[PDB]
Amino acid sequence: DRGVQMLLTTVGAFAAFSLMTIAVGTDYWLYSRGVCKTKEEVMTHSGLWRTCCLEGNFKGLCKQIDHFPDTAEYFLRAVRASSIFPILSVILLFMGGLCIAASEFYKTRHNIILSAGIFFVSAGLSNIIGIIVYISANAGSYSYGWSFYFGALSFIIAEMVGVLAVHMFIDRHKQLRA
């Protein structure tokens, strides 16, 4: 039903946006071993921006990850520093949500739903490039924390909501021609 489809799409968008914003702000991306505060190596929390010291005498103490501790490597370092790919995913998800909102009012345009689909799909692609960049730059034991998996779930949900939006637009234009 239109109703159920629209509700499910709207809920999906909020979930994806919230999950990606939580993930890009929280610091439990990589449970590894390192230094909590530099002027003894212990478990560390790590995130996109700051690393934190768990299990350490200075527990809870956190320091900004030192991005930039070979232009090809400079470019990866820059992209990982200013996490444009992850942050751009949040922006695209936000823009998509605005479009789905503007479907209710200012309706009958039929092209804003397609726009929402394009934004959600594009958000997924940005998210995945972000993951690849992160995983690659974090290679220069370990384990991925719950904020990493929050990011992944955002990708999946965003793709599903994208399919729903395109399908709904198709159904609209089919009803118009029926």
Partner 1 sequence: PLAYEIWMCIVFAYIGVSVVLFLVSRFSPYEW
Ligand X SMILES: CCCCCCCCCCCCCCCC(=O)O
Give me the residues that bind partner 1 (CB under 8 A), please. Answer: 114, 117-118, 121, 124-125, 128, 131-132, 135, 152, 155-156, 159, 162-163, 166, 169-170, 173-174, 177
Question: Residue 165: which of 113, 123, 126 has the closest Cα?
Answer: 113
Residue 98 partner contact from partner 1, ligand X, none using kind-dependent CB cut-offs of 5 to 8 Å: none
CA distances from 166 to 49, 111, 114, 159, 162 (A): 35, 10, 6, 11, 6
Q: Strands, E, within the chain: which ranges?
A: 30-34, 42-44, 50-52, 62-64, 143-144
CA distance 159 to 163: 6
Residue from 143, 174, 177, 178 binding ligand X (CB under 6 A): 143
Q: Which of ligand X, partner 1, none is residue 155 near (CB under 5 to 8 Å by kind)?
A: partner 1
Residue with token string 């960049």? 133
Cβ-based nearer residue to partner 1, 39 or 177? 177
Pick from 144, 150, 155, 169 the residue near ligand X by CB under 6 A: 144
Q: Are 133 and 94 in contact (CB under 8 A)?
A: no
Q: Indicate which of ligand X, partner 1, none lies near residue 143 (CB less than 5 to 8 Å, by partner kind).
A: ligand X
C-beta of 27 vs 159, nearer to ligand X: 159
Binding footprint of ligand X on the chain (CB under 6 A): 143-144, 159-160, 163-164, 167
